[PDB]
Amino acid sequence: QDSLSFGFPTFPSDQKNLIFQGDAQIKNNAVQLTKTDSNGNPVASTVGRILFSAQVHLWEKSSSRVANFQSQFSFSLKSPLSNGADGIAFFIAPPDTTIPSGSGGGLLGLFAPGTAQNTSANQVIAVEFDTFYAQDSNTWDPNYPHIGIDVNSIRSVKTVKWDRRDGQSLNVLVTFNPSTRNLDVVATYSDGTRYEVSYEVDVRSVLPEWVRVGFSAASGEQYQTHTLESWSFTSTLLYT
Amino acid sequence: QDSLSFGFPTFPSDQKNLIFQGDAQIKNNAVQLTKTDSNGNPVASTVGRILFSAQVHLWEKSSSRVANFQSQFSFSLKSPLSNGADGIAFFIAPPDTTIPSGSGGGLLGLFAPGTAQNTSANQVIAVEFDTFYAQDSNTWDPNYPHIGIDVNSIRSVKTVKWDRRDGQSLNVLVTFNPSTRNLDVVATYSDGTRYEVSYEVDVRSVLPEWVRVGFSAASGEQYQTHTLESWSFTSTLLYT
Numbered sequence: 103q104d105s106l107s108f109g110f111p112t113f114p115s116d117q118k119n120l121i122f123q124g125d126a127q128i129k130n131n132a133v134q135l136t137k138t139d140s141n142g143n144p145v146a147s148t149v150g151r152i153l154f155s156a157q158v159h160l161w162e163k164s165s166s167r168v169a170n171f172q173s174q175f176s177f178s179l180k181s182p183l184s185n186g187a188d189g190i191a192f193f194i195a196p197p198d199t200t201i202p203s204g205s206g207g208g209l210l211g212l213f214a215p216g217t218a219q220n221t222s223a224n225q226v227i228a229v230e231f232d233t234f235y236a237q238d239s240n241t242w243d244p245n246y247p248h249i250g251i252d253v254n255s256i257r258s259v260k261t262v263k264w265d266r267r268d269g270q271s272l273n274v275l276v277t278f279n280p281s282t283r284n285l286d287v288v289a290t291y292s293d294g295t296r297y298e299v300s301y302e303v304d305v306r307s308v309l310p311e312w313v314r315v316g317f318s319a320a321s322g323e324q325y326q327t328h329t330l331e332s333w334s335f336t337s338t339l340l341y342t
Numbered sequence: 343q344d345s346l347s348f349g350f351p352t353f354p355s356d357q358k359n360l361i362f363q364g365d366a367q368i369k370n371n372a373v374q375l376t377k378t379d380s381n382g383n384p385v386a387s388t389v390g391r392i393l394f395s396a397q398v399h400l401w402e403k404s405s406s407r408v409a410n411f412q413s414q415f416s417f418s419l420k421s422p423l424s425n426g427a428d429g430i431a432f433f434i435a436p437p438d439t440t441i442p443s444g445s446g447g448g449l450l451g452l453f454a455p456g457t458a459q460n461t462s463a464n465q466v467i468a469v470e471f472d473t474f475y476a477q478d479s480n481t482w483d484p485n486y487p488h489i490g491i492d493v494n495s496i497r498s499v500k501t502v503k504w505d506r507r508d509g510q511s512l513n514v515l516v517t518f519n520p521s522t523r524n525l526d527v528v529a530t531y532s533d534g535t536r537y538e539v540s541y542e543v544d545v546r547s548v549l550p551e552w553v554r555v556g557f558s559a560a561s562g563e564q565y566q567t568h569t570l571e572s573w574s575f576t577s578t579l580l581y582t
């Protein structure tokens with residue numbers, strides 16, 4: 103299909119079109135990407151991702167069209183620790199994408215250690231909300247919590263300072279305009295606090311024609327829950 | 343998802359979200375539900391169906407919601423003969439549906455011979471465009487070409503006389519309103535000739551909460567091509 107759209111105002115337990123990878127699962131009408139104990143508290147060493155089952159037609163070589171897409175979603179992070187880790191990310195990757203071996207912790211379940219910073223060995227575009235930046239382990243991160251745009255590497259092509267707020271929902275709107283090739287990110291907390299970051303990228307040189315979209319999260323030594331509360335997505339092929 | 347929609351203005355050969363069953367295949371940017379020879383001519387004894395991969399949430403017992411839906415599509419029938427058979431149908435059925443054994447010809451690839459008219463034995467709602475009605479083999483049919491609404495039986499609960507036009511595209515709009523429970527069908531040819539038929543049906547008592555939608559077509563001893571040219575679908579769960 104040239105156009106596809108779906109909306110999850112909430113996430114009931116009875117799901118049919120989501121691919122669950124790792125420790126991800128539904129709990130209390132929301133997706134808990136990372137593992138939580140019986141009391142619902144976050145635990146260390148956990149990675150989880152979800153993908154919508156239907157494949158998205160991102161671009162089409164034969165007709166030189168590229169999709170205009172928008173992803174709106176909200177999530178919340180919570181942890182009794184002063185340094186909850188590691189973060190959640192919305193991503194786009196080839197349809198057969200699975201959790202790489204050893205992609206836990208700061209790698210957000212998106213990259214393998216050996217090529218995490220090798221832009222030539224990956225095919226992934228992601229928007230990360232990174233809460234852990236210890237300069238000794240996450241050497242690639244700026245020294246503060248941030249929102250980052252990742253293109254084939256855990257070392258963001260761009261970051262903006264972000265404030266982590268325990269237990270508060272962050273609403274995010276990610277859009278891509280094929281005409282300008284601008285990938286825009288707008289995130290807001292309920293009090294009006296706003297964050298914006300943009301980056302020009304030709305998705306055709308990074309991703310295959312058909313892709314799957316979803317979210318990924320992970321916790322290494324430090325932990326926190328990564329709760330996806332809602333998600334709506336839409337994409338349509340346009341001439342360029 | 344509470345809402346889902348997709349649109350196929352045409353059907354390029356590289357499909358990823360379509361389930362092909364029987365002889366259905368893509369040819370010349372359209373879906374040929376029934377088999378054709380080398381020079382594109384229709385052949386006898388052929389059945390084919392397509393279903394969209396993502397499951398549709400038709401209703402939810404938890405929230406007492408029922409989905410409203412709208413399916414828009416166009417098809418054309420072509421046959422060297424003048425008694426083309428057997429017809430094409432838009433249908434909704436359980437996710438694991440497959441072509442029943444012996445459902446060729448007048449059964450349109452939707453029902454088994456032994457239970458074709460047993461309502462309590464089937465789970466399917468379909469909108470058929472039936473072009474063959476010989477009373478010896480299609481005993482359940484009115485004695486003329488017709489559009490019919492089928493609810494768990496090949497013997498339509500409601501039909502309207504229809505005119506078959508070789509090679510001309512028929513535009514169809516099928517809508518289901520959960521508030522009134524009316525399933526409305528509107529079909530028109532490019533010159534404005536219009537056909538309408540509707541029926542009141544409580545989908546909750548006929549189909550499970552999650553379903554799959556698609557098309558089916560078949561040709562017995564008489565034949566014609568069943569070319570699906572375009573298709574768009576949208577459904578949204580609503581409180582009545």
Ligand SMILES: OC[C@H]1O[C@H](OC[C@H]2O[C@H](OC[C@H]3O[C@@H](O)[C@@H](O)[C@@H](O)[C@@H]3O)[C@@H](O)[C@@H](O[C@H]3O[C@H](CO)[C@@H](O)[C@H](O)[C@@H]3O)[C@@H]2O)[C@@H](O)[C@@H](O)[C@@H]1O
Nearest residue numbers: 185187188206207208209234236238239240321322323324
């Ligand atoms: O989930 C977070 C993080 O977890 C993993 O990283 C492990 C660990 O790496 C560094 O410390 C290594 C080692 O140091 C020893 O002295 C001892 O403490 C041992 O237990 C540690 O494993 C640090 O980056 C560490 O972070 C903590 O210490 C730093 C100071 O060095 C603080 O700034 C920070 O706030 C923490 O208190 C970290 O836990 C990996 O999975 C990694 O990918 C993850 O991002």
Ligand SMILES: OC[C@H]1O[C@H](O[C@@H]2[C@H](O)[C@@H](O)O[C@H](CO)[C@H]2O)[C@@H](O)[C@@H](O)[C@@H]1O
Nearest residue numbers: 427428447448474476479561562563564
């Ligand atoms: O495709 C039409 C029709 O073919 C088969 O039945 C035949 C027709 O009724 C007609 O050709 O007369 C034949 C002799 O009686 C009869 O076999 C079946 O496949 C039927 O299902 C189909 O509608």
Ligand SMILES: [Ca+2]
Nearest residue numbers: 208232234240
């Ligand atoms: Ca980090």
Ligand SMILES: [Ca+2]
Nearest residue numbers: 448472474480
């Ligand atoms: Ca018939």
Ligand SMILES: [Mn+2]
Nearest residue numbers: 232243250258
């Ligand atoms: Mn980062």
Ligand SMILES: [Mn+2]
Nearest residue numbers: 470472483490
């Ligand atoms: Mn009929």
